[PDB]
Amino acid sequence: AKVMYYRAENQPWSPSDADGNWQNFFEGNTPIQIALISKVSPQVVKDIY
Amino acid sequence: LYFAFLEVLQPARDDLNRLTQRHLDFFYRQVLLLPDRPAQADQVHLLFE
Amino acid sequence: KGSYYDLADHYSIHHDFPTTYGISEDGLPPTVPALRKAQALQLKAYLVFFDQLLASYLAQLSHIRDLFSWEVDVTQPQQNDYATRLQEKQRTYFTQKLDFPEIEKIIPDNYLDVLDEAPETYRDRRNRFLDHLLARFSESFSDYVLLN
Amino acid sequence: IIPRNSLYDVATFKLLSDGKDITNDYTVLSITVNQIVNRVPTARIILRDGAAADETFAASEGADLVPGQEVEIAAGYDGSDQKIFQGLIVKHALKVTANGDSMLMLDCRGLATKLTVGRHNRYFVDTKDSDAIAEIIAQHSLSADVAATQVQHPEIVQYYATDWDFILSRAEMNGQIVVAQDEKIKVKAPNTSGAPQITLTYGVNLLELEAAMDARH
Amino acid sequence: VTHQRKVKAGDTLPLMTHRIYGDPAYYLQIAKVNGLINFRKLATNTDLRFPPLEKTQ
Amino acid sequence: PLEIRELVIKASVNEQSAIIAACVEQVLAILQEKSER
Amino acid sequence: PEYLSISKQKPDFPPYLNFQTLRDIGITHLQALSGKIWTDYNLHDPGVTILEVLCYAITDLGYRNNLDIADLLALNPQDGNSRENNFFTPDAVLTCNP
Amino acid sequence: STYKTPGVYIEEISQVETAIPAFIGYTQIAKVGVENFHTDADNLILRPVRITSLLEYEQFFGKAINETTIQVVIQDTTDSRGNLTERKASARITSPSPHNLYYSMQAYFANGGGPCYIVSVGPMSNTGTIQLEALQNGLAEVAKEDEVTLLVFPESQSLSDENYAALMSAALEQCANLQDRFTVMDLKLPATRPIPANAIVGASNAFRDLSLPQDNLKYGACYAPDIETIFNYFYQEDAVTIFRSVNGGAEEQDTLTMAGYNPANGGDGIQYALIESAIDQLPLILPPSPLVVGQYARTDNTRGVWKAPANVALSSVIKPVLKITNEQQNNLNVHPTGKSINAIRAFTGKGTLIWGARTLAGNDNEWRYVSVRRFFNMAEESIKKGSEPFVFEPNDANTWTKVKAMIENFLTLQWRAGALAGAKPEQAFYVKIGLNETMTALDILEGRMIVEIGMAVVRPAEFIILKFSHKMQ
Amino acid sequence: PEELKLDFTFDGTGVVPVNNGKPGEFHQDVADQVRVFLDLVYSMNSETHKPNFLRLIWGDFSFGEKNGFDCLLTDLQINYTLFDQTGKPLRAKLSTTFTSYVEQNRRVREEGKQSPD
Amino acid sequence: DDESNAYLGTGWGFPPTFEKKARSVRLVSAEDDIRESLQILLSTNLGERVMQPNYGCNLQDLLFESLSPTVASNIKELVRTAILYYEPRIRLNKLDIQQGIVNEADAQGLIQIIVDCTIISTNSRFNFVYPFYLQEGS
Amino acid sequence: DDESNAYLGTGWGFPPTFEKKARSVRLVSAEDDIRESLQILLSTNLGERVMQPNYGCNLQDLLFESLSPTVASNIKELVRTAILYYEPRIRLNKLDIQQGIVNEADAQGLIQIIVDCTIISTNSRFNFVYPFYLQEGS
């Protein structure tokens, strides 16, 4: 979520010209989703509640 | 390619994980210079004819 | 004493490619289509997911003496006749900042805050390291009921 | 077959004698080395020597090529050599032929030749063949590597025979082979269960070929 | 025999090792002979020693 | 030959090597065959 | 000069530090994971280039772990804030009042 | 020495016509024959001297000034009991002197030099002063020499921009007047150290603004950047400062100089040898003017003046002080002003090479390249020398035929060598002379004789383009 | 392997022009040429312990599908037929025989064997 | 699955392109996988690959020269050797090299090289396409 | 300690110099150790070393002669043989011998010989420098 994405239409390619970040590349994958699920803690939401 | 990179990287982490043992040995054997203890042989009785 | 070396220094991997990729410090001629410039920027962005792991591996070697130190964590500098430690060293995982050409267009101002460990992991690993260091003198807090 | 990463294909060799490299101190004409299963390794060396005007053999009178010295031979491509032979000089001969050429010939044998120069008598009681073989080998200050057998014998007798012959007889009667090299003797079953090392194709790699079947065996 | 070489602009360790021994694989040994902590970034006035190979392997 | 110890050893360096080999396979074949019933 | 002649095992390094072994393991894993879509494994393929560069970097990492432990734990001579914070000396541990 | 007894004695050690340079600068001695050129401080003798070697240089002009700003640090690592275990040394210079003719002559001869002319404009001094008037007087004197073909000012980078432009304008003016000379120039870099990454852009912007004459630019060329080489410094022993460090600590100055370590004064010979080596490992920085004329001479002596002097590796060079990129070279050899600058660059597995061969008139359709301009200079001078034996003869056809035959023979020899294009000699050149073709009756009556010549010269290639095609089968 | 036969001449009496474009220049040094030739094609290389590999090229000539001949020297003879009053030669005639050379890896690739394999 | 030309292989394109809406990297195949191969081979020098000192082609060693016959033959030898060692999937027909002709001053400085090739209808023992090369051999 | 050029060796200078304030004898190294070597070799005759009858060079056998071609070739043969046998650390390039030109009468009586050499970047099996020669061989 911290790395910039560029295309041919974003000239002169300054950070304010970027087309978002690289996170969408990792959104629809199944192993990464399973790994994201197995690292959650219930105590956080319990304390907030 | 990223999955394969992690698989190839594993043995170097296995090597890095010997540092606790190397630390303890440096403390006991070089800063304090204490040696270990040798063995002792056993004995028997025999009868002849 | 031994000999002191800089064990944390990392030479960026973008330097190990043939120059036809445009990734190196030479770059591209300005007389190219915009597509090739975009293509070079995308590949530079791609390789950070590997440079970060190599740099983190070496940062873990530079900081061994901070895993086994007996120092007391303090948030407000003070004199209490004990050795003390400030917030920048209260970690069990350490990291570095990358350096390659055109970094300012790809990895902006500060990005390391997302790499910090959760406080629960810090507490658990610090507690286990302190237990191990106490055990070398044949003593542990678990034997004293009124202490916990 | 030619090693990979060879920039030049010049073949080289090295002949050490009691640890000293003597390759470029004499004129070497030929070298032959044989490694065969169930036999003692052998090597033969031919050098140029002799001069009628001086009336002597200069390299024969030296102290590097006399019987009893340790010889080691290595060879390879382009200066990267591998150990091939290690043994002792046994024979030392001179020769002048009809047309006047003169040479010096050396005959080297492995260390297992120490096992073939006498007749002995021994008893063994309640042991296996592997134990008798290991003991006979170890008495000559050689390393032994003997695979174990399962048959235990009430008695074994070595009657007025050589150590080499006794060992080979007892090994063959158990279906095993003997390989001797580098101060080491290994007794074990033939290795027919492995993976191939190279491929030799007629019309690609071969210079000569012979093969035969016989139904009567 | 023993070789000696000076590092100039554009040199890398595996390529020098290949140009002397005919095989880059020895580079990790050379770095140890000369005391190189980081062998992927060389300085341009270093004189490196290349020892001979062992007589029989 | 089918054996490696039955090969003729080469001792010269300056140049008829294929006639001292044919006249050795013939003798060994005349001599081995002389031992079968 | 400690080393007067060298070999593939003199100075000696652990057997996992071998470029060819790392490369072969990487290629086998790549074929096992994606061998049904990415089938071209010649030298012109960018993926093999990236793999080789990564194996070279990993060899560097493994190299830096075999330095003597006395050198891995050395203190900085130029940092005035460097202190001893790991060890006790024999005079402070092995002693006892009469 | 003097010899009387017969025997064997041991003593210390005592042409490319198209590439002959004149080097103008300050020297140490200037003693030729029985005259001392530096006898009178306000009456100096300015005279070109022909030299063939470094030894012949040293016989007349000497060596370099001693440096006074060198420091050497000795690093000791000891045992826990104070016993010494290892000792190292390293050296640094704070501010080198701007008098560099001796180092320039070493660098020149190392790269394939030959006979040259030396012009002294005064003695070297510890004050480090370089003045424009002395250099212009040296140029006015070298105008006398005839054999010269190249002009070099190794010390010109110490001038301000206006004086630099004035000197370069004078040089280009006399090359345009004599029509047989060529000028080689260096680019001035900023003195900020360590150099910033984009120094060369500002440096070229400063160069493009100099007031050079617009009609004489085809007679010179500019190169960049400076070069780091392996030649040794000269120094005064008692002026070298020595520092020590122990186990990586802070440095402290000791009370002896290098002179206090000389065995001749009772010092330690081991540490003395260590310090000498430490000093000899310092790299020395030069402008790339001498190395380039050395490469000119070598290239002409192996391939000919029509071969472009580029894409060859340089001798005795460690590296270039700056690294020049593709985006930066894009604006150096092609520019709206036409004032191209020739880059020196390093390549992997190859070394340091010259990369570009254009003049300061880089957009011109005829004088874009260095090699074409120098070929025309050579050919014109050779034809002139061939023509000289016909002066004072009758002005009639019996002389015109002889002159024509001579010129055509020369051009045929040039065609066979591959300098001129064309499959037949008639496609390579033409020569014409005659009444009512090149001359009128009045010129003939006045004693004038006119000849017209045309030539087709080969040109070098800078770019290679690959294209792929595919057939189905 | 293919065989190649060549004969040529060195002459230094001052009647053969030098192809460099200068007027009045003729060939006048035989010994230098013999020296550089023998050092390049005949003597042993101190790093490989054998003579060098050679490639023969003549402009636009084509031997076949290639523009050069890769080879090794096998035979050479020199005849000295004219001498100076100090003993230095003025003319030499040379005859050479070369044999074709091509590496293993490359040979099996040139034979692009297509079979039911 | 067994399609047509599967034995020629598929791979990464050059230069690498990443799509974000379609979360993938661009892949080429058949004849495009071959053409791009050539573009790599002739744009890399010999020492630029980390453990592969023999991969590449030194064309830039012939810049700043006039196109004489002795230069054309050298260009041809270099290109033929590189293609023979590193392109088993094609057959090379001829090499055309020309200098000159646009401005007749800019045209003088450029060299043009044309590569003509065809694609062999059989496989090759030196082609590392999976899984055929595990059985086709080396 | 392993410095640069250690394989070339260090030794005594010629002629021997003794310092008294620094209680030591002068020692040379690298290129100076080689130059001085030459000065010895060409100034010693063949029979002057006690058990080394083959060390030296008989140049004074050519005095009182005019410089004809047959004399120059003999000088060259002697010098080349001496250097080949006793200077393994250098490579000899060429020998320049001239007679004549100072007074044109004194100049006539002297002969001048110039020796041009370079230093080999590798070691040699015939170099007795310690401790390399215990392993580099003979």
Side-chain angles (χ1 to χ4, degrees), chain I residues 38-54:
Chain I
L38 281 180
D39 203 66
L40 200 66
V41 308
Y42 174 71
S43 323
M44 180 184 280
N45 189 316
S46 63
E47 319 193 352
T48 69
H49 317 308
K50 62 179 182 60
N52 293 325
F53 291 98
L54 304 169

Side-chain angles (χ1 to χ4, degrees), chain H residues 113-416:
Chain H
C116 36
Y117 284 83
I118 308 299
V119 183
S120 295
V121 301
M124 293 188 290
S125 96
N126 264 116
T127 299
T129 321
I130 295 168
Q131 295 187 328
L132 181 62
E133 296 81 7
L135 299 172
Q136 282 187 319
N137 290 343
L139 184 62
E141 286 296 300
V142 79
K144 299 180 179 180
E145 282 298 342
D146 186 14
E147 214 194 350
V148 184
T149 60
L150 297 165
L151 301 170
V152 185
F153 300 87
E155 293 171 358
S156 57
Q157 286 178 321
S158 301
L159 300 174
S160 68
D161 289 349
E162 293 177 350
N163 292 341
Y164 185 87
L167 186 62
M168 291 298 103
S169 309
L172 290 175
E173 221 74 49
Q174 86 163 241
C175 316
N177 281 335
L178 298 176
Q179 305 180 50
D180 61 306
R181 302 185 180 189
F182 195 77
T183 304
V184 177
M185 309 177 185
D186 266 318
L187 185 70
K188 289 176 48 174
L189 302 173
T192 302
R193 298 291 181 273
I195 307 205
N198 287 237
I200 200 161
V201 175
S204 49
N205 285 338
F207 182 79
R208 301 264 207 276
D209 297 3
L210 298 172
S211 64
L212 302 177
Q214 184 68 10
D215 273 317
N216 297 320
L217 291 174
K218 65 190 178 191
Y219 284 105
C222 199
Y223 296 82
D226 295 0
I227 290 169
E228 182 176 323
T229 189
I230 64 178
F231 300 113
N232 299 326
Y233 282 97
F234 282 77
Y235 55 89
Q236 185 187 329
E237 221 171 73
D238 181 65
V240 177
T241 301
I242 307 298
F243 298 86
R244 285 181 178 271
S245 200
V246 180
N247 291 325
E251 297 178 358
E252 183 178 2
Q253 186 177 342
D254 61 356
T255 59
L256 300 177
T257 58
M258 182 176 175
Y261 290 85
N262 197 320
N265 298 321
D268 185 2
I270 305 300
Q271 293 183 77
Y272 190 71
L274 186 66
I275 295 168
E276 300 188 44
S277 308
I279 290 175
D280 277 7
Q281 289 293 304
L282 279 164
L284 192 145
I285 312 298
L286 292 172
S289 295
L291 307 181
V292 169
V293 292
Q295 292 294 327
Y296 280 20
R298 185 188 59 76
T299 302
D300 304 344
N301 192 37
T302 38
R303 306 292 296 274
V305 294
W306 55 92
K307 168 73 176 75
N311 196 20
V312 202
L314 306 171
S315 280
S316 300
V317 169
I318 300 299
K319 66 175 182 180
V321 299
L322 275 69
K323 185 172 183 176
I324 298 169
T325 71
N326 289 333
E327 172 178 1
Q328 294 173 333
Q329 186 173 355
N330 197 63
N331 288 293
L332 291 177
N333 64 312
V334 177
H335 193 268
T337 58
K339 297 172 179 172
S340 64
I341 299 166
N342 295 308
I344 298 171
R345 291 174 62 170
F347 297 87
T348 298
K350 289 179 167 63
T352 302
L353 315 177
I354 297 168
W355 209 248
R358 289 193 179 198
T359 67
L360 293 170
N363 289 321
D364 193 276
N365 281 333
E366 291 181 352
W367 307 117
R368 175 180 287 117
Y369 294 113
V370 173
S371 62
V372 178
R373 179 74 265 171
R374 289 188 71 225
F375 173 80
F376 267 89
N377 283 346
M378 181 279 295
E380 291 171 355
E381 183 178 2
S382 313
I383 287 170
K384 181 182 184 291
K385 284 181 178 178
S387 302
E388 284 172 351
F390 293 101
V391 178
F392 303 112
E393 297 222 60
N395 200 4
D396 56 9
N398 292 331
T399 304
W400 305 341
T401 36
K402 295 176 185 172
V403 174
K404 182 173 175 180
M406 181 272 295
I407 294 166
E408 284 180 340
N409 287 340
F410 176 78
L411 288 171
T412 300
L413 288 177
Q414 294 302 308
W415 170 74
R416 276 197 184 89

Side-chain angles (χ1 to χ4, degrees), chain G residues 77-78, chain H residues 248-249:
Chain G
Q78 299 296 308

Side-chain angles (χ1 to χ4, degrees), chain D:
Chain D
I1 45 186
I2 307 285
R4 190 66 178 182
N5 289 284
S6 197
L7 296 178
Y8 325 94
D9 279 324
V10 187
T12 78
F13 69 93
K14 285 180 181 180
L15 177 63
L16 319 178
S17 160
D18 285 359
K20 188 169 70 172
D21 189 350
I22 62 168
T23 306
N24 288 316
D25 300 32
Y26 305 97
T27 283
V28 180
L29 300 181
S30 90
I31 296 173
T32 303
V33 173
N34 291 278
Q35 298 272 335
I36 295 100
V37 165
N38 288 331
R39 299 179 77 85
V40 201
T42 310
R44 186 175 180 178
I45 307 166
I46 313 296
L47 313 181
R48 179 168 75 92
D49 199 272
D54 311 288
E55 305 178 347
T56 177
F57 283 74
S60 161
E61 295 182 8
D64 291 312
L65 308 171
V66 293
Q69 285 191 289
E70 263 280 4
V71 173
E72 181 166 334
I73 314 170
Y77 280 107
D78 220 12
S80 318
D81 301 312
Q82 296 182 36
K83 182 186 178 189
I84 290 177
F85 176 86
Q86 175 187 338
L88 297 165
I89 295 170
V90 175
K91 203 180 178 183
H92 187 180
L94 306 178
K95 184 172 182 179
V96 180
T97 189
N99 69 350
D101 289 17
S102 63
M103 63 194 71
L104 186 141
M105 308 181 283
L106 302 173
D107 197 45
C108 319
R109 302 290 166 102
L111 303 173
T113 36
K114 290 182 175 181
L115 296 167
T116 62
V117 199
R119 290 180 181 267
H120 301 283
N121 305 291
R122 293 186 178 88
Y123 286 105
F124 309 90
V125 188
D126 283 279
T127 73
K128 304 174 178 178
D129 288 6
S130 44
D131 299 315
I133 288 168
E135 178 188 61
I136 289 175
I137 292 169
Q139 286 190 4
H140 284 271
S141 64
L142 296 172
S143 178
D145 175 0
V146 183
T149 64
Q150 288 102 49
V151 181
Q152 182 167 21
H153 293 276
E155 74 280 66
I156 309 168
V157 181
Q158 178 184 359
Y159 175 78
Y160 205 55
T162 313
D163 289 350
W164 183 256
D165 298 339
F166 185 74
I167 287 169
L168 279 185
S169 303
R170 295 315 302 159
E172 282 205 331
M173 280 304 153
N174 284 274
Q176 299 181 340
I177 62 170
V178 191
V179 178
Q181 58 185 94
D182 305 330
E183 322 177 2
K184 182 175 181 179
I185 297 177
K186 302 183 301 180
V187 181
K188 68 172 193 176
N191 185 8
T192 59
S193 43
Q197 304 294 296
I198 43 163
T199 303
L200 301 176
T201 305
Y202 169 63
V204 181
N205 291 322
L206 303 180
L207 300 198
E208 275 179 9
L209 172 60
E210 300 194 27
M213 287 181 180
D214 192 337
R216 288 174 296 178
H217 309 304

Side-chain angles (χ1 to χ4, degrees), chain H residues 47-118:
Chain H
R47 185 183 297 160
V49 179
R50 188 176 183 274
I51 301 299
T52 322
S53 178
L54 271 175
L55 295 171
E56 193 173 20
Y57 177 88
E58 292 171 359
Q59 286 182 342
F60 303 119
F61 304 110
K63 296 183 178 181
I65 279 183
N66 296 335
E67 296 288 353
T68 37
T69 53
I70 300 168
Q71 301 184 341
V72 179
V73 183
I74 300 171
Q75 303 178 319
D76 290 355
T77 299
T78 81
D79 181 46
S80 70
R81 295 281 301 186
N83 301 330
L84 185 73
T85 38
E86 182 64 300
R87 177 173 283 122
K88 302 288 186 190
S90 52
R92 68 173 81 98
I93 300 207
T94 309
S95 80
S97 162
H99 289 276
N100 57 0
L101 273 183
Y102 182 71
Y103 305 135
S104 296
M105 296 313 296
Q106 283 179 307
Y108 166 74
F109 279 112
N111 275 263
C116 36
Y117 284 83
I118 308 299

Side-chain angles (χ1 to χ4, degrees), chain G residues 1 4-5, chain K residues 1-2 135:
Chain G
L4 299 178
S5 73
Chain K
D1 184 1
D2 181 65
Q135 186 173 355

